[PDB]
Design a protein around this ligand. Sequence first.
Ligand SMILES: *C(=O)c1ccc(S(N)(=O)=O)cc1
Ligand SMILES: *C(=O)c1ccc(S(N)(=O)=O)cc1
Ligand SMILES: [Zn+2]
Ligand SMILES: [Zn+2]
Ligand SMILES: [Zn+2]
Ligand SMILES: [Zn+2]
Ligand SMILES: [Zn+2]
Ligand SMILES: [Zn+2]
Ligand SMILES: [Zn+2]
Ligand SMILES: [Zn+2]
Ligand SMILES: [Zn+2]
Ligand SMILES: [Zn+2]
Ligand SMILES: [Zn+2]
Ligand SMILES: [Zn+2]
Ligand SMILES: [Zn+2]
Ligand SMILES: [Zn+2]
Ligand SMILES: [Zn+2]
Lengths: 257, 257
Amino acid sequence: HWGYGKHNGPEHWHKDFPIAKGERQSPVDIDTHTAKYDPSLKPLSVSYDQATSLRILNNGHAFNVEFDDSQDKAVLKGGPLDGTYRLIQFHFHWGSLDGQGSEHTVDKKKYAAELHLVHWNTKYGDFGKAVQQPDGLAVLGIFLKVGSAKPGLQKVVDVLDSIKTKGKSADFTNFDPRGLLPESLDYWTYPGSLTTPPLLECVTWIVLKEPISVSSEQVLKFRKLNFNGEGEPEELMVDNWRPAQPLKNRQIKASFK
Amino acid sequence: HWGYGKHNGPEHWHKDFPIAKGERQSPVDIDTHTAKYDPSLKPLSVSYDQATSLRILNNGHAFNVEFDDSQDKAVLKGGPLDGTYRLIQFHFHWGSLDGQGSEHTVDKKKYAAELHLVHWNTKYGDFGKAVQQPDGLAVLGIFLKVGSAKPGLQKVVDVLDSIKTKGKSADFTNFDPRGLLPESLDYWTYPGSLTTPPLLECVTWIVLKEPISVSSEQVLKFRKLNFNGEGEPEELMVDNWRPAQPLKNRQIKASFK
Ligand SMILES: *C(=O)c1ccc(S(N)(=O)=O)cc1
Ligand SMILES: *C(=O)c1ccc(S(N)(=O)=O)cc1
Ligand SMILES: [Zn+2]
Ligand SMILES: [Zn+2]
Ligand SMILES: [Zn+2]
Ligand SMILES: [Zn+2]
Ligand SMILES: [Zn+2]
Ligand SMILES: [Zn+2]
Ligand SMILES: [Zn+2]
Ligand SMILES: [Zn+2]
Ligand SMILES: [Zn+2]
Ligand SMILES: [Zn+2]
Ligand SMILES: [Zn+2]
Ligand SMILES: [Zn+2]
Ligand SMILES: [Zn+2]
Ligand SMILES: [Zn+2]
Ligand SMILES: [Zn+2]
Protein backbone atom coordinates (compact mmCIF):
# COMPACT_ATOMS: atom_id res chain seq x y z
CA HIS A 1 0.00 0.00 0.00
CA TRP A 2 1.21 3.57 -0.90
CA GLY A 3 2.26 6.09 1.79
CA TYR A 4 4.96 8.73 2.52
CA GLY A 5 7.86 6.37 3.58
CA LYS A 6 11.33 5.61 2.04
CA HIS A 7 9.92 2.73 -0.13
CA ASN A 8 6.16 3.59 -0.72
CA GLY A 9 6.26 7.45 -0.97
CA PRO A 10 5.68 9.95 -3.86
CA GLU A 11 8.87 8.84 -5.80
CA HIS A 12 7.38 5.23 -5.88
CA TRP A 13 3.66 5.99 -6.63
CA HIS A 14 4.21 5.77 -10.45
CA LYS A 15 4.83 1.95 -10.11
CA ASP A 16 1.20 1.31 -8.95
CA PHE A 17 -0.58 4.49 -10.27
CA PRO A 18 0.81 5.20 -13.77
CA ILE A 19 -1.03 8.61 -14.03
CA ALA A 20 1.54 9.86 -11.37
CA LYS A 21 3.63 10.88 -14.45
CA GLY A 22 0.66 12.48 -16.26
CA GLU A 23 0.52 15.94 -17.91
CA ARG A 24 -1.55 17.65 -15.11
CA GLN A 25 -0.12 16.48 -11.75
CA SER A 26 -0.56 18.40 -8.45
CA PRO A 27 0.72 20.06 -6.50
CA VAL A 28 2.81 22.71 -8.35
CA ASP A 29 5.05 25.68 -7.48
CA ILE A 30 3.15 28.99 -8.05
CA ASP A 31 5.72 31.50 -9.43
CA THR A 32 4.15 34.99 -8.95
CA HIS A 33 6.28 36.22 -11.97
CA THR A 34 4.26 33.94 -14.42
CA ALA A 35 0.95 33.34 -12.51
CA LYS A 36 -0.63 36.46 -14.14
CA TYR A 37 -3.84 38.37 -13.15
CA ASP A 38 -6.83 37.28 -15.35
CA PRO A 39 -9.56 40.00 -15.44
CA SER A 40 -11.94 37.41 -17.13
CA LEU A 41 -12.10 35.36 -13.83
CA LYS A 42 -15.59 35.89 -12.24
CA PRO A 43 -15.62 36.32 -8.41
CA LEU A 44 -15.49 33.06 -6.35
CA SER A 45 -18.77 32.17 -4.52
CA VAL A 46 -18.38 30.07 -1.29
CA SER A 47 -21.80 29.06 0.18
CA TYR A 48 -21.04 27.15 3.47
CA ASP A 49 -23.84 28.57 5.74
CA GLN A 50 -25.77 25.22 5.86
CA ALA A 51 -22.69 22.85 5.85
CA THR A 52 -23.62 19.58 7.69
CA SER A 53 -20.45 17.86 9.09
CA LEU A 54 -21.01 14.07 9.75
CA ARG A 55 -17.78 12.32 10.82
CA ILE A 56 -13.99 12.66 11.23
CA LEU A 57 -11.67 9.71 10.40
CA ASN A 58 -8.00 8.70 10.34
CA ASN A 59 -7.56 6.91 6.97
CA GLY A 60 -3.81 6.17 7.52
CA HIS A 61 -2.75 9.13 5.25
CA ALA A 62 -4.53 12.16 6.86
CA PHE A 63 -7.80 12.83 8.76
CA ASN A 64 -11.00 13.63 6.78
CA VAL A 65 -13.99 15.62 8.08
CA GLU A 66 -16.89 14.33 5.92
CA PHE A 67 -20.02 16.40 5.05
CA ASP A 68 -23.58 15.54 3.95
CA ASP A 69 -23.32 16.00 0.13
CA SER A 70 -26.87 14.73 -0.74
CA GLN A 71 -27.89 18.44 -1.25
CA ASP A 72 -26.43 21.90 -2.15
CA LYS A 73 -25.90 22.81 1.60
CA ALA A 74 -22.17 23.59 1.13
CA VAL A 75 -21.16 24.57 -2.45
CA LEU A 76 -18.50 26.39 -4.51
CA LYS A 77 -19.71 28.41 -7.57
CA GLY A 78 -18.16 31.05 -9.89
CA GLY A 79 -14.41 31.73 -10.14
CA PRO A 80 -13.15 29.32 -12.83
CA LEU A 81 -16.09 26.85 -12.26
CA ASP A 82 -19.10 26.09 -14.49
CA GLY A 83 -21.95 24.74 -12.30
CA THR A 84 -22.31 23.65 -8.65
CA TYR A 85 -19.56 21.83 -6.65
CA ARG A 86 -20.67 20.18 -3.32
CA LEU A 87 -18.28 19.95 -0.33
CA ILE A 88 -17.70 16.21 0.45
CA GLN A 89 -14.68 16.44 2.85
CA PHE A 90 -11.70 18.52 4.03
CA HIS A 91 -8.29 17.27 5.23
CA PHE A 92 -4.80 18.72 5.83
CA HIS A 93 -1.22 17.90 4.80
CA TRP A 94 1.48 18.98 7.34
CA GLY A 95 5.18 18.63 8.18
CA SER A 96 7.41 17.31 10.99
CA LEU A 97 8.79 20.95 11.26
CA ASP A 98 7.23 24.44 10.71
CA GLY A 99 9.43 25.02 7.59
CA GLN A 100 7.59 22.30 5.57
CA GLY A 101 4.16 20.63 5.16
CA SER A 102 2.39 22.45 2.25
CA GLU A 103 1.90 20.65 -1.12
CA HIS A 104 1.64 23.85 -3.22
CA THR A 105 4.50 26.38 -2.83
CA VAL A 106 4.53 30.14 -3.67
CA ASP A 107 7.88 31.22 -5.22
CA LYS A 108 9.23 27.91 -3.69
CA LYS A 109 8.13 28.96 -0.12
CA LYS A 110 6.70 25.92 1.76
CA TYR A 111 4.05 26.55 4.49
CA ALA A 112 3.62 24.52 7.75
CA ALA A 113 0.48 22.79 6.34
CA GLU A 114 -2.19 22.98 3.64
CA LEU A 115 -5.99 22.60 4.04
CA HIS A 116 -7.91 20.94 1.12
CA LEU A 117 -11.71 21.49 0.92
CA VAL A 118 -12.85 18.84 -1.65
CA HIS A 119 -15.96 19.50 -3.82
CA TRP A 120 -17.48 17.55 -6.76
CA ASN A 121 -19.52 18.76 -9.79
CA THR A 122 -23.26 17.86 -9.30
CA LYS A 123 -23.45 17.46 -13.13
CA TYR A 124 -21.95 13.92 -12.59
CA GLY A 125 -24.34 12.37 -10.00
CA ASP A 126 -21.69 11.17 -7.44
CA PHE A 127 -17.99 11.62 -6.44
CA GLY A 128 -16.92 8.29 -8.09
CA LYS A 129 -18.18 9.52 -11.50
CA ALA A 130 -16.90 13.12 -10.96
CA VAL A 131 -13.23 11.95 -10.53
CA GLN A 132 -13.35 10.52 -14.12
CA GLN A 133 -13.94 14.06 -15.61
CA PRO A 134 -11.44 16.95 -16.07
CA ASP A 135 -14.10 19.35 -14.59
CA GLY A 136 -15.22 16.83 -11.92
CA LEU A 137 -13.62 18.27 -8.74
CA ALA A 138 -12.77 21.67 -7.28
CA VAL A 139 -10.29 21.68 -4.38
CA LEU A 140 -10.00 24.88 -2.32
CA GLY A 141 -6.40 24.94 -0.97
CA ILE A 142 -5.53 27.13 2.05
CA PHE A 143 -1.97 27.57 3.45
CA LEU A 144 -1.29 27.27 7.24
CA LYS A 145 1.49 29.26 8.99
CA VAL A 146 2.32 29.18 12.74
CA GLY A 147 1.21 32.25 14.75
CA SER A 148 -2.05 32.98 16.58
CA ALA A 149 -4.53 30.13 17.24
CA LYS A 150 -7.27 29.63 14.58
CA PRO A 151 -10.43 29.60 16.81
CA GLY A 152 -12.44 27.77 14.06
CA LEU A 153 -9.79 24.93 14.13
CA GLN A 154 -10.15 24.22 17.89
CA LYS A 155 -13.18 21.86 17.55
CA VAL A 156 -11.14 19.66 15.08
CA VAL A 157 -7.92 19.58 17.19
CA ASP A 158 -9.95 18.76 20.38
CA VAL A 159 -11.33 15.45 18.87
CA LEU A 160 -8.01 14.08 17.37
CA ASP A 161 -7.14 11.91 20.46
CA SER A 162 -10.36 9.89 19.61
CA ILE A 163 -8.99 9.02 16.07
CA LYS A 164 -5.21 8.66 16.82
CA THR A 165 -4.76 5.43 14.72
CA LYS A 166 -5.69 4.32 11.14
CA GLY A 167 -9.30 3.06 10.57
CA LYS A 168 -10.77 5.01 13.57
CA SER A 169 -13.60 7.55 13.18
CA ALA A 170 -15.98 9.60 15.38
CA ASP A 171 -19.34 11.37 15.02
CA PHE A 172 -18.42 15.04 14.17
CA THR A 173 -21.54 17.27 13.86
CA ASN A 174 -22.17 21.05 13.71
CA PHE A 175 -18.62 21.88 12.46
CA ASP A 176 -18.58 25.23 10.56
CA PRO A 177 -15.92 25.15 7.78
CA ARG A 178 -16.25 29.01 7.42
CA GLY A 179 -14.14 29.15 10.63
CA LEU A 180 -11.15 27.74 8.63
CA LEU A 181 -11.19 30.50 5.93
CA PRO A 182 -8.82 33.49 5.62
CA GLU A 183 -10.26 37.06 5.19
CA SER A 184 -9.49 37.29 1.41
CA LEU A 185 -10.74 34.69 -1.13
CA ASP A 186 -8.21 36.04 -3.71
CA TYR A 187 -6.83 32.87 -5.43
CA TRP A 188 -4.67 31.15 -8.04
CA THR A 189 -6.30 28.49 -10.31
CA TYR A 190 -4.86 25.78 -12.64
CA PRO A 191 -6.04 22.34 -13.92
CA GLY A 192 -4.47 19.49 -11.88
CA SER A 193 -4.88 16.20 -9.98
CA LEU A 194 -5.55 14.47 -6.70
CA THR A 195 -2.23 14.81 -4.71
CA THR A 196 -2.70 11.21 -3.36
CA PRO A 197 -3.34 7.97 -5.29
CA PRO A 198 -5.29 7.51 -7.44
CA LEU A 199 -3.82 10.94 -8.60
CA LEU A 200 -6.70 11.40 -11.11
CA GLU A 201 -6.45 14.53 -13.37
CA CYS A 202 -9.96 15.76 -12.44
CA VAL A 203 -9.28 18.86 -10.28
CA THR A 204 -9.75 22.58 -10.82
CA TRP A 205 -7.32 23.81 -8.11
CA ILE A 206 -8.29 27.04 -6.33
CA VAL A 207 -5.36 28.04 -4.03
CA LEU A 208 -5.93 31.08 -1.75
CA LYS A 209 -3.29 33.86 -1.59
CA GLU A 210 -3.99 34.50 2.15
CA PRO A 211 -2.72 31.87 4.64
CA ILE A 212 -4.50 31.25 7.98
CA SER A 213 -2.59 31.33 11.29
CA VAL A 214 -2.73 28.27 13.53
CA SER A 215 -0.97 28.03 16.94
CA SER A 216 2.09 25.77 17.39
CA GLU A 217 -0.15 23.89 19.96
CA GLN A 218 -2.81 23.29 17.21
CA VAL A 219 -0.18 22.05 14.66
CA LEU A 220 1.47 19.89 17.43
CA LYS A 221 -1.85 17.94 17.75
CA PHE A 222 -1.71 17.12 13.98
CA ARG A 223 1.84 15.75 14.52
CA LYS A 224 0.61 13.38 17.33
CA LEU A 225 -1.69 11.40 14.97
CA ASN A 226 -0.40 7.93 13.80
CA PHE A 227 -0.10 6.40 10.26
CA ASN A 228 -0.22 2.91 11.91
CA GLY A 229 -3.23 0.94 13.23
CA GLU A 230 -3.90 0.40 16.98
CA GLY A 231 -1.58 -2.40 18.27
CA GLU A 232 1.20 -1.64 15.68
CA PRO A 233 4.45 0.27 16.45
CA GLU A 234 3.92 4.08 16.38
CA GLU A 235 4.72 5.87 13.08
CA LEU A 236 3.92 9.63 13.60
CA MET A 237 1.59 11.05 10.89
CA VAL A 238 3.96 13.86 9.66
CA ASP A 239 5.32 14.90 6.19
CA ASN A 240 2.09 13.53 4.52
CA TRP A 241 2.67 15.96 1.54
CA ARG A 242 3.63 15.36 -2.14
CA PRO A 243 6.30 17.82 -3.45
CA ALA A 244 5.79 20.21 -6.43
CA GLN A 245 5.23 18.32 -9.77
CA PRO A 246 6.22 19.63 -13.25
CA LEU A 247 3.93 22.47 -14.45
CA LYS A 248 4.46 21.09 -18.01
CA ASN A 249 2.22 23.18 -20.26
CA ARG A 250 -0.23 24.61 -17.71
CA GLN A 251 -1.33 28.20 -17.12
CA ILE A 252 -1.72 29.37 -13.47
CA LYS A 253 -4.18 32.35 -13.37
CA ALA A 254 -4.45 34.92 -10.52
CA SER A 255 -7.85 36.35 -9.43
CA PHE A 256 -6.03 39.54 -8.17
CA LYS A 257 -3.44 42.24 -9.36
CA HIS B 1 -17.94 2.28 -1.12
CA TRP B 2 -19.63 -0.98 -2.43
CA GLY B 3 -21.00 -3.48 0.11
CA TYR B 4 -24.06 -5.68 0.78
CA GLY B 5 -26.60 -3.00 1.94
CA LYS B 6 -29.86 -1.67 0.36
CA HIS B 7 -28.06 1.04 -1.73
CA ASN B 8 -24.47 -0.35 -2.27
CA GLY B 9 -25.18 -4.14 -2.63
CA PRO B 10 -24.99 -6.67 -5.52
CA GLU B 11 -28.21 -5.29 -7.19
CA HIS B 12 -26.46 -1.84 -7.43
CA TRP B 13 -22.80 -2.87 -8.28
CA HIS B 14 -23.47 -2.58 -12.08
CA LYS B 15 -23.87 1.26 -11.65
CA ASP B 16 -20.19 1.61 -10.54
CA PHE B 17 -18.65 -1.57 -12.11
CA PRO B 18 -19.88 -2.21 -15.68
CA ILE B 19 -18.28 -5.73 -15.80
CA ALA B 20 -20.99 -6.80 -13.24
CA LYS B 21 -23.18 -7.56 -16.32
CA GLY B 22 -20.35 -9.29 -18.24
CA GLU B 23 -20.53 -12.65 -20.10
CA ARG B 24 -18.77 -14.75 -17.36
CA GLN B 25 -20.05 -13.50 -13.95
CA SER B 26 -19.93 -15.57 -10.71
CA PRO B 27 -21.44 -17.13 -8.81
CA VAL B 28 -23.95 -19.34 -10.75
CA ASP B 29 -26.59 -21.98 -9.96
CA ILE B 30 -25.26 -25.53 -10.67
CA ASP B 31 -28.22 -27.52 -12.17
CA THR B 32 -27.19 -31.22 -11.88
CA HIS B 33 -29.51 -31.99 -14.94
CA THR B 34 -27.24 -29.88 -17.32
CA ALA B 35 -23.86 -29.82 -15.41
CA LYS B 36 -22.80 -33.12 -17.12
CA TYR B 37 -19.96 -35.59 -16.25
CA ASP B 38 -16.78 -34.90 -18.35
CA PRO B 39 -14.58 -38.06 -18.56
CA SER B 40 -11.62 -35.90 -19.85
CA LEU B 41 -11.36 -33.97 -16.48
CA LYS B 42 -8.13 -35.04 -14.62
CA PRO B 43 -8.29 -35.63 -10.82
CA LEU B 44 -7.72 -32.46 -8.75
CA SER B 45 -4.30 -32.21 -6.98
CA VAL B 46 -4.41 -30.15 -3.70
CA SER B 47 -0.85 -29.75 -2.29
CA TYR B 48 -1.19 -27.79 1.02
CA ASP B 49 1.34 -29.81 3.17
CA GLN B 50 3.75 -26.78 3.47
CA ALA B 51 1.08 -23.97 3.62
CA THR B 52 2.48 -20.91 5.58
CA SER B 53 -0.39 -18.80 7.03
CA LEU B 54 0.74 -15.19 7.94
CA ARG B 55 -2.22 -13.04 9.10
CA ILE B 56 -6.03 -12.72 9.37
CA LEU B 57 -7.85 -9.43 8.63
CA ASN B 58 -11.34 -7.90 8.55
CA ASN B 59 -11.38 -5.93 5.23
CA GLY B 60 -15.00 -4.65 5.74
CA HIS B 61 -16.45 -7.32 3.32
CA ALA B 62 -15.20 -10.63 4.84
CA PHE B 63 -12.12 -11.88 6.75
CA ASN B 64 -9.03 -13.08 4.81
CA VAL B 65 -6.40 -15.54 6.05
CA GLU B 66 -3.27 -14.63 4.03
CA PHE B 67 -0.52 -17.08 3.02
CA ASP B 68 3.15 -16.70 2.04
CA ASP B 69 2.86 -17.12 -1.78
CA SER B 70 6.58 -16.43 -2.63
CA GLN B 71 7.02 -20.22 -3.39
CA ASP B 72 5.02 -23.37 -4.40
CA LYS B 73 4.31 -24.28 -0.68
CA ALA B 74 0.49 -24.47 -1.20
CA VAL B 75 -0.72 -25.12 -4.78
CA LEU B 76 -3.71 -26.37 -6.82
CA LYS B 77 -2.78 -28.52 -9.89
CA GLY B 78 -4.66 -30.91 -12.24
CA GLY B 79 -8.44 -30.91 -12.67
CA PRO B 80 -9.22 -28.28 -15.36
CA LEU B 81 -5.99 -26.26 -14.65
CA ASP B 82 -2.89 -25.85 -16.86
CA GLY B 83 0.10 -25.11 -14.60
CA THR B 84 0.54 -24.26 -10.92
CA TYR B 85 -1.83 -21.99 -8.91
CA ARG B 86 -0.44 -20.65 -5.55
CA LEU B 87 -2.74 -20.17 -2.54
CA ILE B 88 -2.74 -16.42 -1.58
CA GLN B 89 -5.78 -16.27 0.80
CA PHE B 90 -9.06 -17.93 1.87
CA HIS B 91 -12.26 -16.23 3.09
CA PHE B 92 -15.95 -17.13 3.59
CA HIS B 93 -19.35 -15.73 2.59
CA TRP B 94 -22.22 -16.45 5.07
CA GLY B 95 -25.83 -15.52 5.90
CA SER B 96 -27.86 -13.95 8.76
CA LEU B 97 -29.81 -17.33 8.85
CA ASP B 98 -28.78 -21.01 8.14
CA GLY B 99 -31.11 -21.04 5.03
CA GLN B 100 -28.78 -18.63 3.10
CA GLY B 101 -25.10 -17.56 2.81
CA SER B 102 -23.58 -19.54 -0.12
CA GLU B 103 -22.78 -17.72 -3.43
CA HIS B 104 -22.98 -20.84 -5.66
CA THR B 105 -26.21 -22.90 -5.39
CA VAL B 106 -26.83 -26.59 -6.36
CA ASP B 107 -30.29 -27.11 -7.95
CA LYS B 108 -31.13 -23.66 -6.34
CA LYS B 109 -30.26 -24.96 -2.80
CA LYS B 110 -28.36 -22.25 -0.80
CA TYR B 111 -25.92 -23.43 1.93
CA ALA B 112 -25.25 -21.58 5.27
CA ALA B 113 -21.83 -20.33 3.97
CA GLU B 114 -19.15 -20.86 1.27
CA LEU B 115 -15.33 -21.06 1.68
CA HIS B 116 -13.16 -19.62 -1.18
CA LEU B 117 -9.50 -20.72 -1.37
CA VAL B 118 -7.94 -18.17 -3.82
CA HIS B 119 -4.96 -19.19 -6.02
CA TRP B 120 -3.13 -17.40 -8.87
CA ASN B 121 -1.31 -18.82 -11.96
CA THR B 122 2.52 -18.67 -11.40
CA LYS B 123 2.82 -18.17 -15.20
CA TYR B 124 2.01 -14.44 -14.59
CA GLY B 125 4.65 -13.48 -11.95
CA ASP B 126 2.25 -11.87 -9.36
CA PHE B 127 -1.48 -11.71 -8.37
CA GLY B 128 -1.96 -8.19 -9.87
CA LYS B 129 -0.94 -9.46 -13.35
CA ALA B 130 -2.85 -12.78 -12.95
CA VAL B 131 -6.26 -10.98 -12.39
CA GLN B 132 -5.91 -9.43 -15.93
CA GLN B 133 -5.88 -12.93 -17.58
CA PRO B 134 -8.82 -15.31 -18.23
CA ASP B 135 -6.73 -18.24 -16.76
CA GLY B 136 -5.17 -16.06 -14.02
CA LEU B 137 -7.01 -17.38 -10.90
CA ALA B 138 -8.44 -20.66 -9.61
CA VAL B 139 -10.91 -20.46 -6.71
CA LEU B 140 -11.69 -23.69 -4.81
CA GLY B 141 -15.27 -23.25 -3.44
CA ILE B 142 -16.48 -25.41 -0.50
CA PHE B 143 -20.08 -25.30 0.85
CA LEU B 144 -20.72 -25.04 4.65
CA LYS B 145 -23.79 -26.63 6.30
CA VAL B 146 -24.68 -26.56 10.03
CA GLY B 147 -24.13 -29.84 11.92
CA SER B 148 -21.01 -31.14 13.71
CA ALA B 149 -18.12 -28.75 14.52
CA LYS B 150 -15.29 -28.55 11.92
CA PRO B 151 -12.21 -29.07 14.20
CA GLY B 152 -9.90 -27.47 11.52
CA LEU B 153 -12.04 -24.22 11.71
CA GLN B 154 -11.74 -23.74 15.53
CA LYS B 155 -8.36 -21.86 15.31
CA VAL B 156 -10.03 -19.29 12.92
CA VAL B 157 -13.23 -18.87 15.02
CA ASP B 158 -11.11 -18.39 18.23
CA VAL B 159 -9.31 -15.25 16.78
CA LEU B 160 -12.43 -13.46 15.31
CA ASP B 161 -13.13 -11.29 18.42
CA SER B 162 -9.56 -9.82 17.93
CA ILE B 163 -10.51 -8.62 14.34
CA LYS B 164 -14.19 -7.62 15.03
CA THR B 165 -14.05 -4.25 13.10
CA LYS B 166 -12.90 -3.22 9.55
CA GLY B 167 -9.11 -2.76 9.17
CA LYS B 168 -8.29 -4.98 12.23
CA SER B 169 -5.72 -7.77 11.66
CA ALA B 170 -3.70 -10.27 13.74
CA ASP B 171 -0.70 -12.59 13.33
CA PHE B 172 -2.12 -15.98 12.21
CA THR B 173 0.70 -18.56 11.82
CA ASN B 174 0.78 -22.38 11.42
CA PHE B 175 -2.85 -22.61 10.21
CA ASP B 176 -3.39 -25.85 8.19
CA PRO B 177 -5.96 -25.23 5.39
CA ARG B 178 -6.19 -29.06 4.83
CA GLY B 179 -8.36 -29.03 8.02
CA LEU B 180 -11.09 -27.13 6.07
CA LEU B 181 -11.43 -29.74 3.21
CA PRO B 182 -14.20 -32.38 2.78
CA GLU B 183 -13.28 -36.09 2.13
CA SER B 184 -14.16 -36.07 -1.63
CA LEU B 185 -12.50 -33.66 -4.11
CA ASP B 186 -15.27 -34.42 -6.68
CA TYR B 187 -16.06 -31.02 -8.27
CA TRP B 188 -17.91 -28.85 -10.79
CA THR B 189 -15.88 -26.36 -12.93
CA TYR B 190 -16.83 -23.38 -15.19
CA PRO B 191 -15.10 -20.10 -16.29
CA GLY B 192 -16.22 -17.10 -14.16
CA SER B 193 -15.31 -13.99 -12.15
CA LEU B 194 -14.44 -12.55 -8.76
CA THR B 195 -17.76 -12.47 -6.76
CA THR B 196 -16.84 -8.99 -5.34
CA PRO B 197 -15.82 -5.79 -7.18
CA PRO B 198 -13.76 -5.57 -9.30
CA LEU B 199 -15.65 -8.75 -10.54
CA LEU B 200 -12.81 -9.52 -13.04
CA GLU B 201 -13.48 -12.44 -15.47
CA CYS B 202 -10.18 -14.16 -14.52
CA VAL B 203 -11.36 -17.27 -12.52
CA THR B 204 -11.50 -21.00 -13.19
CA TRP B 205 -14.12 -21.98 -10.55
CA ILE B 206 -13.69 -25.40 -8.91
CA VAL B 207 -16.71 -26.04 -6.61
CA LEU B 208 -16.64 -29.21 -4.44
CA LYS B 209 -19.70 -31.54 -4.45
CA GLU B 210 -19.19 -32.49 -0.73
CA PRO B 211 -19.98 -29.70 1.80
CA ILE B 212 -18.18 -29.56 5.19
CA SER B 213 -20.09 -29.39 8.52
CA VAL B 214 -19.57 -26.47 10.89
CA SER B 215 -21.31 -26.12 14.29
CA SER B 216 -24.01 -23.48 14.86
CA GLU B 217 -21.54 -22.06 17.53
CA GLN B 218 -18.81 -21.72 14.80
CA VAL B 219 -21.20 -19.97 12.31
CA LEU B 220 -22.58 -17.73 15.17
CA LYS B 221 -19.00 -16.29 15.63
CA PHE B 222 -18.89 -15.38 11.86
CA ARG B 223 -22.18 -13.44 12.40
CA LYS B 224 -20.61 -11.38 15.28
CA LEU B 225 -18.00 -9.70 13.00
CA ASN B 226 -18.69 -6.04 11.97
CA PHE B 227 -18.74 -4.39 8.48
CA ASN B 228 -18.15 -1.05 10.27
CA GLY B 229 -14.86 0.47 11.51
CA GLU B 230 -14.00 1.34 15.13
CA GLY B 231 -16.04 4.44 16.18
CA GLU B 232 -18.96 3.71 13.74
CA PRO B 233 -22.37 2.25 14.75
CA GLU B 234 -22.40 -1.62 14.70
CA GLU B 235 -23.46 -3.25 11.38
CA LEU B 236 -23.20 -7.09 11.72
CA MET B 237 -21.11 -8.73 8.95
CA VAL B 238 -23.89 -11.08 7.61
CA ASP B 239 -25.32 -11.76 4.08
CA ASN B 240 -21.90 -10.90 2.48
CA TRP B 241 -22.85 -13.05 -0.60
CA ARG B 242 -23.68 -12.26 -4.26
CA PRO B 243 -26.68 -14.21 -5.69
CA ALA B 244 -26.54 -16.50 -8.79
CA GLN B 245 -25.65 -14.59 -12.04
CA PRO B 246 -26.80 -15.51 -15.60
CA LEU B 247 -24.98 -18.64 -16.92
CA LYS B 248 -25.27 -17.21 -20.48
CA ASN B 249 -23.42 -19.56 -22.84
CA ARG B 250 -21.25 -21.30 -20.22
CA GLN B 251 -20.72 -25.07 -19.77
CA ILE B 252 -20.49 -26.36 -16.15
CA LYS B 253 -18.58 -29.72 -16.15
CA ALA B 254 -18.80 -32.43 -13.42
CA SER B 255 -15.67 -34.46 -12.45
CA PHE B 256 -18.05 -37.34 -11.30
CA LYS B 257 -21.20 -39.42 -12.30
C1 LIG C 1 -9.84 11.29 -2.73
O1 LIG C 1 -11.04 11.39 -2.45
C2 LIG C 1 -8.99 12.42 -2.79
C3 LIG C 1 -7.61 12.36 -3.03
C4 LIG C 1 -6.83 13.52 -3.03
C5 LIG C 1 -7.41 14.76 -2.75
S1 LIG C 1 -6.42 16.28 -2.71
N1 LIG C 1 -5.13 16.01 -1.74
O2 LIG C 1 -5.81 16.50 -4.10
O3 LIG C 1 -7.34 17.39 -2.19
C6 LIG C 1 -8.77 14.85 -2.51
C7 LIG C 1 -9.54 13.69 -2.51
C1 LIG D 1 -9.61 -10.24 -4.57
O1 LIG D 1 -8.40 -10.47 -4.62
C2 LIG D 1 -10.60 -11.26 -4.63
C3 LIG D 1 -11.94 -10.96 -4.88
C4 LIG D 1 -12.92 -11.94 -4.93
C5 LIG D 1 -12.57 -13.28 -4.72
S1 LIG D 1 -13.80 -14.49 -4.79
N1 LIG D 1 -15.01 -14.21 -3.96
O2 LIG D 1 -14.31 -14.59 -6.24
O3 LIG D 1 -13.08 -15.77 -4.29
C6 LIG D 1 -11.26 -13.62 -4.49
C7 LIG D 1 -10.28 -12.61 -4.44
ZN1 LIG E 1 10.20 3.88 -12.24
ZN1 LIG F 1 4.38 -0.55 -5.30
ZN1 LIG G 1 9.65 33.67 -10.53
ZN1 LIG H 1 -22.27 32.16 3.47
ZN1 LIG I 1 -5.07 4.06 1.84
ZN1 LIG J 1 -22.53 11.24 -0.34
ZN1 LIG K 1 -5.14 16.99 0.04
ZN1 LIG L 1 -8.43 41.06 -3.62
ZN1 LIG M 1 -9.34 0.60 19.81
ZN1 LIG N 1 -29.53 -0.15 -13.02
ZN1 LIG O 1 -22.87 3.28 -6.96
ZN1 LIG P 1 -21.58 5.62 -8.45
ZN1 LIG Q 1 -32.52 -29.05 -13.35
ZN1 LIG R 1 -13.59 -2.60 -0.22
ZN1 LIG S 1 -15.30 -15.21 -2.15
